[PDB]
Symmetry: C6
Amino acid sequence: GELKAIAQELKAIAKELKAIAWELKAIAQ
Amino acid sequence: GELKAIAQELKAIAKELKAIAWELKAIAQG
Amino acid sequence: GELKAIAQELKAIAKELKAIAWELKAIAQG
Amino acid sequence: GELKAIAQELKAIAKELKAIAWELKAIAQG
Amino acid sequence: GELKAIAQELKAIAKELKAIAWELKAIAQ
Amino acid sequence: GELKAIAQELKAIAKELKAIAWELKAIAQ
């Protein structure tokens, strides 16, 4: 239901932030 | 319902973070 | 209600991330 | 109530993202 | 319980965004 | 249950933002 859907969107948000962290690491080197 | 509306705004947030990741990749790769 | 208030703050968060994406595009040079 | 507390933290998050957008605008140079 | 735990993680998120704002200000010189 | 799962994803989000702050600190030095 809707609470699982919320947890799944937060998982997608964490995944995009992981990608941002990786790109910033690239910029840092 | 309001819980679906919350899930939809989180989807929009994930979409903007994807765009930010792409722009950071652009900055990283000139 | 409080659930609508939560959805509205998430909308404001999505709006600020959109602005950040645009500024990063500017930094990237377009 | 706990739901109001959640909305208030999301408001603080939107405020920090606004500050980040402003700093990025400074870096962008407009 | 779980709703207080959610508010507390959002507080930690606001704190990390404050740190990011500070680092960006440093980069901005 | 689902509310704990939401708190756990927010914890993962705070962790990724901490990593982003750390990479930006690296770039700042």
